[PDB]
Write an enzyme that holds these catalytic residues in place. Sequence first.
Site, PDB file in Angstrom:
ATOM      1  N   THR A   2       4.003  45.621  41.469  1.00  0.00           N
ATOM      2  CA  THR A   2       2.866  45.678  40.433  1.00  0.00           C
ATOM      3  C   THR A   2       2.456  44.578  39.705  1.00  0.00           C
ATOM      4  O   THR A   2       1.352  43.930  39.733  1.00  0.00           O
ATOM      5  CB  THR A   2       3.101  46.962  39.694  1.00  0.00           C
ATOM      6  OG1 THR A   2       3.256  48.145  40.563  1.00  0.00           O
ATOM      7  CG2 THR A   2       1.796  46.954  38.765  1.00  0.00           C
ATOM      8  N   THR A   3       3.609  43.942  39.071  1.00  0.00           N
ATOM      9  CA  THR A   3       3.241  42.657  38.456  1.00  0.00           C
ATOM     10  C   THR A   3       3.050  41.331  39.398  1.00  0.00           C
ATOM     11  O   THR A   3       2.421  40.415  38.898  1.00  0.00           O
ATOM     12  CB  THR A   3       4.406  42.278  37.560  1.00  0.00           C
ATOM     13  OG1 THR A   3       5.658  42.310  38.303  1.00  0.00           O
ATOM     14  CG2 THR A   3       4.617  43.358  36.337  1.00  0.00           C
TER      15      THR A   3
ATOM     16  N   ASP B 137      14.124  51.753  41.158  1.00  0.00           N
ATOM     17  CA  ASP B 137      13.627  50.621  41.456  1.00  0.00           C
ATOM     18  C   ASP B 137      14.497  49.691  42.515  1.00  0.00           C
ATOM     19  O   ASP B 137      13.930  49.139  43.473  1.00  0.00           O
ATOM     20  CB  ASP B 137      12.985  49.578  40.420  1.00  0.00           C
ATOM     21  CG  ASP B 137      12.282  50.122  39.608  1.00  0.00           C
ATOM     22  OD1 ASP B 137      11.399  50.901  40.074  1.00  0.00           O
ATOM     23  OD2 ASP B 137      11.882  49.588  38.316  1.00  0.00           O
TER      24      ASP B 137
END
Lengths: 484, 492, 501, 505
Positions: free
Chosen positions: C79-80, C366
């Site tokens: 996402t980042t 994650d």
Amino acid sequence: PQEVRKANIIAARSVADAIRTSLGPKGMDKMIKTSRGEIIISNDGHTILKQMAILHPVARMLVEVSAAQDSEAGDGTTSVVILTGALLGAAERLLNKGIHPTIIADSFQSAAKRSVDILLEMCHKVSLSDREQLVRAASTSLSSKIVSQYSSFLAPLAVDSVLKISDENSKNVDLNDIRLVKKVGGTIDDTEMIDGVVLTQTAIKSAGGPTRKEKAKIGLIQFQISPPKPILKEERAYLLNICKKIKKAKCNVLLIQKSILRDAVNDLALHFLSKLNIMVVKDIEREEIEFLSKGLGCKPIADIELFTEDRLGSADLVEEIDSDGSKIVRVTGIRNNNARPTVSVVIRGANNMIIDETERSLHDALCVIRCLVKERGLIAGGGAPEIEISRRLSKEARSMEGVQAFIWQEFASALEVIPTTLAENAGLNSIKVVTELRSKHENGELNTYEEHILQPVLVSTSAITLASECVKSILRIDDIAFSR
Amino acid sequence: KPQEVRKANIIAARSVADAIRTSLGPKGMDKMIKTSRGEIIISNDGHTILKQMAILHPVARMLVEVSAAQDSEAGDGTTSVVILTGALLGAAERLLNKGIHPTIIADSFQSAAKRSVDILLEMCHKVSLSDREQLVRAASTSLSSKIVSQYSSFLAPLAVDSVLKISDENSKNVDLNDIRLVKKVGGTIDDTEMIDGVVLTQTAIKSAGGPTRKEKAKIGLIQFQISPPKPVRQMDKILKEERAYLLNICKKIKKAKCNVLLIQKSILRDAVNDLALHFLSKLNIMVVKDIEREEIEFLSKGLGCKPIADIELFTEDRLGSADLVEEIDSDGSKIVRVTGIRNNNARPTVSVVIRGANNMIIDETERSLHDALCVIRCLVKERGLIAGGGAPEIEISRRLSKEARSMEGVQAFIWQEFASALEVIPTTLAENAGLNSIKVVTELRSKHENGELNNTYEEHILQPVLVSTSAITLASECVKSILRIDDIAFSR
Amino acid sequence: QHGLEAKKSHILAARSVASIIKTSLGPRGLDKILISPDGEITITNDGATILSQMELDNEIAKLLVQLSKSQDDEIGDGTTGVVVLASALLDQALELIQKGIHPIKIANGFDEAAKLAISKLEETCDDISASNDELFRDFLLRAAKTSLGSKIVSKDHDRFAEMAVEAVINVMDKDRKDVDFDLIKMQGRVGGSISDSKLINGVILDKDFSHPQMPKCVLPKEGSDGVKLAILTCPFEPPKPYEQDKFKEMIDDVKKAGADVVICQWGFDDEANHLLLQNDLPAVRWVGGQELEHIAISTNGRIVPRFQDLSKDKLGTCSRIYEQEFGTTKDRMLIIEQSKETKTVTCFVRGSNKMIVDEAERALHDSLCVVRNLVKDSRVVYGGGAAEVTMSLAVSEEADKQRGIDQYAFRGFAQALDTIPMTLAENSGLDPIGTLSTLKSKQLKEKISNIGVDCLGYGSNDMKELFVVDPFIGKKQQILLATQLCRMILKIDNVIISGKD
Amino acid sequence: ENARLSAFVGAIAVGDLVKSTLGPKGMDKLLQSASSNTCMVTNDGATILKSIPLDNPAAKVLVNISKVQDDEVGDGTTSVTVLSAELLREAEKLIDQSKIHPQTIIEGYRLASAAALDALTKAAVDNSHDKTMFREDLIHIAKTTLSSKILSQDKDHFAELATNAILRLKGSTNLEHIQIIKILGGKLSDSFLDEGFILAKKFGNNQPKRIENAKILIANTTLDTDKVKIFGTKFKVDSTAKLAQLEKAEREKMKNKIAKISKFGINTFINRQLIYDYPEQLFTDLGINSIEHADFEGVERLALVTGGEVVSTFDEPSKCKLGECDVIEEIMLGEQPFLKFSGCKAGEACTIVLRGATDQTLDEAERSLHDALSVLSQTTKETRTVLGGGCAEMVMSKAVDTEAQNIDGKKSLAVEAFARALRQLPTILADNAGFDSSELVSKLRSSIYNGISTSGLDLNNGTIADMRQLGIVESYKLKRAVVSSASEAAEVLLRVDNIIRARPR
């Protein structure tokens, strides 16, 4: 941080200077008009500060100091506020010189302990065994009240009551055990000690009540005589078992706590208790619940099953004294070895304004006598103890070193505010009278003795101790924040 | 915020560069400027715009000094140097946001300017001054921007032959102030006289007694003026005092063997008395008065003489040398010419004479031939020529982009932004011509890969290498002087 | 808005949102405190959670949440990476608009630049199984160590590294390589520590086995086949269009079929626990309809609609069922494992605080997504900033050979890839411009290799010695979504926001 | 831009309320409500912070820090916020005139805190003197904890094993250094203390049970049959014999991992998983013995006693942290083989083997032993104090200045800034004392700089005096609790580049 402290000191100085004008009987009285329209007038500092509704947080601490002033010493509620403001006024220049409040706060506590030993050396040593100074102490203290000729009759009554409960090492004695019951009628000349106990109300005036019983037991009972409340024989059957369980423990005195919820004693139960000659006294106030549990050594009983014989006291004779508009019931010979006998004196008089001020006047007389119990000896007032301390601190201030050396110089200057106010309230010149007192100080010391004006040592001692910690706690708060 | 004060000056400097950017090229957009005095002037020349713009901004005035040196040194590119200066200022805005100190930004421009010159010289074709066919076609193309076209063919050898005499070898800087364009009323463009010795701005004496011609004359420079004193037996007394004062000055002239003398023009008092002309007429001494004050410094150089303030210090060694002095008037000119000075210290200073009927003739011709001498001056100091129109700027940006990886640190990123700052010049030329901006720029990188400098050669577009060299050098010092100012305060 | 207006505002709107997560990018970033409206409190640096909590009325940043929602299923950890990379393309796109280039050319220009850079990375890529097989275990163990280094898990990370390896493999096939997030259950409770966390191969249901007198462990019953469990889709009650007689008829179908434990969707009466206590048959109550599918798949069971349809083939069989007391918690949950590989995996993590459990839960989840991408493609690339530098030098060099309008579109794509190593250099305490020029010089004159920005403090280049690898399918998915996002932003030239009534 | 001000300057105002309240002579604060009649005056820092509503979203971080400190010990909660406020106050100079990465500043604190804790250990004193009376009272306290526990049967033998399990450690008293083994078929009275690190499993088959001059290396890898789940794979081969070629090719690649082990010269190997016969058979010629089923504690506790490392990978050959032991002896007790190590270099640990008669006695004895050992281990952190009154605060500044000598360019200003905050503790204590803090702290640093490490500041006399003669000491456990709490609190705050306000509950 000084913006918070200096704003609180100036705000507290204006309050102390306002109460300062009320010192003495000739002082300037302060008027407070409540939002509801009530206006009170008096010179009492504890009453003014309580009804003033001060919004300043630090200034509200004077109410707690004035409350402990009357509870411990019993006098000087106005003088302790003046001494508190005197130290705050002299502390304004201390912050300008860069002095940290810790040295200012620690020096007040060290000077208060040394000021006690100075007063004890100049005080005259007396004992409680001599009744000459004890009677004259309470007689001269009543010269500020309407009573004059009757003040000499009540003087030995207050002396003999304290000496019995003072003992030796008991030191502080609880004042809650002393209850003065006032009632319209009678006069001051009629007084009865009644060391057993005294209630606040009369007895049953209905028909059939004996109102007098000999060799009865007294105990606290929170129950109440009422019909069933979630036909004549049904209600009498429910009340029969109630009076039968009381007969099991042979309790002839029933004390029912006053409550507006239900009634006290049913009329049908009066005929049942008339055969057994069981006296009942109703309308017992909530404040008397804790009072009766101390001197009588009894326990409050909530339910009928909790009622036992071991929790009942002993009363030799219980009778109702016949008097105009009074009808006071007395109890003698409680026969309690563990608990000390309580002191309750009935105050009588024709006018309602008599028994009122008389009760307040006797409270101040018992406190002054109680001051001799903790610490014996007395020091004449009128600025004598305030100036005598400043005389010894003149040469002692030179023996100190550092920042504390300057505090002893300002501490003696703040003590001169009390004798200065006494000279101003009398119309005399402030400085002129103070100089005449210090001029004769080389010869005379305590000399007011011929005027029959005496003051206990605890008032002058507690005024310095309470004002020392007061100002000490003021400088501890350097900030004020909103917390909810 | 010491830098925000400088950033406010950078934004104000980019607004001036964007205004001049639209005026680049002959198809550029003109700018209308109304002076406070009421004069309304318009033109596409960037040097004339910034001169009358009266910029009150302290940093923005640096472009005026660069434009003045741009015309004095190279003579061309006064508009393009402003665009190149604003390009580095725009790229420096993103450099300040990354925490880069302007010293590294200014120091990297010195290495970037010297590198761009060496790369340009490799692709440039070195030419020599011995070939006169190259100088004629070079100056003829500069005259195609003016109304005069068919008559400009005879003016091409005029400017070429004048420089080749004073060029010699290793002359480095050659001052064109010694070459003056004489503008007189009458004649035509095809009528021109070189007169390599010298040419004055004034006529001769039209009164009686003036010889107007002398053989083997010495022309000196005298700032003095012969006039009666200007701080009725009485009539003759004044005449004897005036004639004696006028004769005493002429006594030292005869002993000094002065055939021709000059008198500075003064409108206050009289220049030369009529009696002084008759006194020197018997001595066969030619007199030329009303000499302009602007030509005093000019004649003190090419003639190799020195001005004489006082007659007491006047000697013979301060005079000139002339073989023949005559007055030749084509039509109405009445001008005196001098040939064969042959001075050791002085050089052959040549003054070009331009003849014309209408006022718009000698005017437009003066500015046309002045720029032609600057282009020739560029070839004398630095040999070689390149094709104009932003062609070399494309290949320089390509070579510096690949060589940027050889560096390391913060300075390596500056080479990438420096290559993009050089593409603004060819982009503006495509925008002002009506062509698509981005479309023409993409066609430049495509064609310049396979070919090298290949067509403006068929279109006779030749830009001297010294203009492209001085444009980068002056821009490196101009942008440096900007970023080095961190604050400004009132000083008086 | 108009063309001269919205096109300028769309660039500034994306830079304000992107600059917020630039400080939290990487293991050295910032952990932000977020509180969900449901009452869950946790602290994590994951961008998918931070971006989902962002509520704003600008339509440019709303496309980030829409893209991160679909990316969360594919990867979820990128996402980042995509937001910063997509914002870098918009920065170079703003300059191309001022040069007279249509905005549709920028969208189509990045399509050819992205596909060209993929073939260049594959040539320099290396394979795991084709090089060293024994290092395949160390690649999966050290992959989660980087993401867990910023959390308290980094102390016990040695044991937790093997737990994430087996959780991904169980739900996937070697040839198929399909991993579903719904098959991996993430749960946790308050109390205990992380050292007692173990892997569970089956469901949980948080059942205490009703009355404690029932046995806490299931016996094999003289070598029977697994442990049979009952699944009932009908509530427990007497039939209605005597009540004790109907209870004895339904329990006989469980005893004859051999089902040890009974699972139902509806509650039971108090008499049911009395009859099941004598036969040692624990009961299960209050099971959701979604959790009924994971039980029959893992235990190889079937859905029995009626009472009399039970049979030994329709009962789910597991390895065993035991009740293990966890700390002082009175729940006393269960663990159902299986010998054979099932499709259901449940992760169980304990912590001393509620905030610690949720912090290690998403941190471990994650790690499962990172291993998911490593097993999908055996070929991996060196990360840490080396992927963006290598792919940028290939596009910038080939930009001169590709002519036309797209020539400048390729240069902007190479400069946009430099945003990632310059952002990580600022978070690592290094010069972003000096490091970018250093990485390009070492990969040109010396030799071609992959050297990225240093995540941990060191003195020089060549992180390859540390064996830091990133999945090829993970890095390729980021550049495809970032390119598709940049094209979609250019396709919206107007912002229409209706008012409120 | 305002996030750094609210996290630094905004956090100071929160700590200013507890700044002047530190110490017995410290000032007080006022908590006032709307009605103003419910107020109170107290010096408690935890009450003032929780009562005042804080609109600052960054101030809620320090709220959870005080809650963690209160769990450990109820003293020193105020000093945690005050010490953390000094680190944030100096952070302003760490930005403007410094420009240093915040994580590098935090990493500099870990190097400074490592030397600060070591400096306080050498200067720490204790009441343990005359241990003859101290060591005798340790067994009597353990017997009191045996009530309600099955260990109450014999007080002398069971409490003696717990007494020697503490003092013989000579190090960290945490239970991570104590191994507990639960076994069956015996009596609790036969339990004894053994340091040989006894574990249940055995290793090897034809290998001998005695090893002399053993070299222990710890690593975690799977060398036998990776990818334990084979379901779903598709094997495409032209013949059955060609399918086994991929498995045989993996065996040849095992020599690369074995070569790195053989170059280390170790006869003992540690493996969590299993090992195939071929790589195990090659270990016979090299004399390498592999231990299996090491769990987690067994991996970490082996590296502590033998001085090993827990890393499972090799970053470079012939460089690693290696242990050793003199003799590895394998015995058998209770019909099961046991492993008793002997001669571990610098080994400090103890293993209490609890032999019960059933499973119920094993779980109750292990939980009761941890409670008994917790009381004995508490005596190490209790009653042990250090010299206070500015002494210990200034001594920590000397250890920071030592690290400030050799340092890089980035952490030079970070380590030096930490030394300034250490001297702020005696400065604030001297503020409310009524004396000059600048004069006392200045003269204290020059005295301890050269010799005289036991000197301190006297609050009564306002001068430097010997702390051993005055008898003013502060607990050593309180010192480590504040530094550890301030290091974790400042680690999160310095990393904050933006503030996200929490959702109100």
